UniProtKB/Swiss-Prot annotation, chain A:
Gene: Ywhab
Modification after translation: Isoform alpha differs from isoform beta in being phosphorylated. Phosphorylated on Ser-60 by protein kinase C delta type catalytic subunit in a sphingosine-dependent fashion. Isoform Short contains a N-acetylmethionine at position 1.
Site, as annotated: Interaction with phosphoserine on interacting protein: 58, 129
Similarity remark: Belongs to the 14-3-3 family.
Protein name: 14-3-3 protein beta/alpha
Entry GO MF terms: histone deacetylase binding; identical protein binding; phosphoserine residue binding; protein domain specific binding; protein kinase inhibitor activity; protein phosphatase inhibitor activity; protein sequestering activity; protein-containing complex binding
Chain positions found as N-acetylmethionine: 1
Ubl conjugation in keyword set: yes
Organism: Mus musculus (Mouse)
Function noted in UniProt: Adapter protein implicated in the regulation of a large spectrum of both general and specialized signaling pathways. Binds to a large number of partners, usually by recognition of a phosphoserine or phosphothreonine motif. Binding generally results in the modulation of the activity of the binding partner. Negative regulator of osteogenesis. Blocks the nuclear translocation of the phosphorylated form (by AKT1) of SRPK2 and antagonizes its stimulatory effect on cyclin D1 expression resulting in blockage of neuronal apoptosis elicited by SRPK2.
N-acetylthreonine: residues carrying this PTM: 2
Gene3D superfamilies: 14-3-3 domain (1.20.190.20)
Residues where N6-acetyllysine is found: 5, 51, 70, 117
Length: 234, 233
């Protein structure tokens, strides 16, 4: 948008406080479309806004999907359940596609440092993952594959360029391992990935911190908890 | 759109389960616009949908208003708080105005029994009251006056036609008394209305019935609590 960036950012913050996450996302999409690299604060606002927008549609889709499954002899209740589920699905797809287009058009190509690049490639993986959850047929294999590919690309960059305790690297490992567990139904790959990322970070508990170690240890703990759970479920 | 009434109702119910109240409201608006008197189930769906739609905006408006009064020294910051509040205010106005138009064009004129008519006039009062909360200047006096007028018209019918324990009649007295107290700053009139409604209901306990016993006595208790609070001030 042609609106002042600082005004759009302030509107995003107000929208967040008002719990008007569709407004928050529109403000940050407008900031993105100015075509400058986002600051850390701006990137976080964009990410929170769309998480919450897509989150609301995912929750509605789960509720309506349950109703629609559940055998329905009543012709109008059944047909309206299915049509409404389809309407929510399309809304969700449109949101994810809008994010994916921001990523491909502005965010990934304007990213000039490895950490930002990893952050955005991770987000691409996350939004393909959301699309996967509602996809069917060939489109499902395609979205799953695209999600894996974005997460893998992020991950190789993060291993080459970032410290293993960096919270963005750790957050990627968390999400990627959970992708394997929940989307690909592969607890073995999920464990293998989470274990390596956890062990690599452990090898560098030489952060500083003692004052700020928790920026890393809190996600490390999430990885370690998944590992213990997964190992004690197989 | 091509949906028939049964489809729209089913959609409204699905929308409610999904917490998609804007969709719920749009479905009940379309049902209304078909021009038939609403069933009791339908009238309740419409009321719940719009309560939730408007309630969300009002909640946002209160949040923004509070932030705007903490500060903030900016050319933007106080200015953006005000502009964003104003955006919320126009959204709220558009919702209330849509309801008011449904009420003026379909609901009130198609109502064939007193209880419906009172319900919808009360709602007209309620939605002019919501508009008042964000109005300023001359438009504020106009919305307040319109709220009072609709509540009054409802009240005159209810006293003539409905039992004093009827939950709609009691709910009207509650909302109307609270209007006088909170919006018009007239505690004496507020107390008088609440006290009369409470006293009339209590004199006719045998008109209570199993189906609406709880609904009635809960409102009667609200009226009695306001009365105790107000008289204490």
């Amino acid at each position: 948008m042609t609106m002042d960036k600082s005004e759009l950012v302030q509107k995003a913050k107000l929208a967040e406080q008002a719990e008007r996450y569709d407004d928050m996302a529109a403000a940050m999409k407008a900031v993105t479309e100015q075509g400058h690299e986002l600051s850390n604060e701006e990137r976080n606002l964009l990410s929170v806004a769309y998480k919450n927008v897509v989150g609301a549609r995912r929750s509605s889709w789960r509720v309506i999907s349950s109703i629609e499954q559940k055998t329905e002899r009543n012709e109008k209740k059944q047909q309206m359940g299915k049509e409404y589920r389809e309407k929510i699905e399309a809304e969700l797809q449109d949101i994810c596609n809008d994010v994916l287009e921001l990523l491909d058009k502005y965010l990934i190509l304007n990213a000039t440092q490895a950490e930002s690049k990893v952050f955005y490639l991770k987000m691409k993986g996350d939004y393909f993952r959301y699309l996967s959850e509602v996809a069917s047929g060939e489109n499902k294999q395609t979205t799953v594959s695209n999600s894996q590919q974005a997460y893998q690309e992020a991950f190789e960059i993060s291993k080459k360029e970032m410290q293993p305790t960096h919270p963005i690297r750790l957050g990627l490992a968390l999400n990627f391992s959970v992708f394997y567990y929940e989307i690909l139904n592969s607890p073995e790959k999920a464990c293998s990935l989470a274990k390596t990322a956890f062990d690599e970070a452990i090898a560098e508990l030489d952060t500083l911190n003692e004052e700020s170690y928790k920026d890393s240890t809190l996600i490390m703990q999430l990885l370690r908890d998944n590992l213990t759970l997964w190992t004690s479920e197989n």
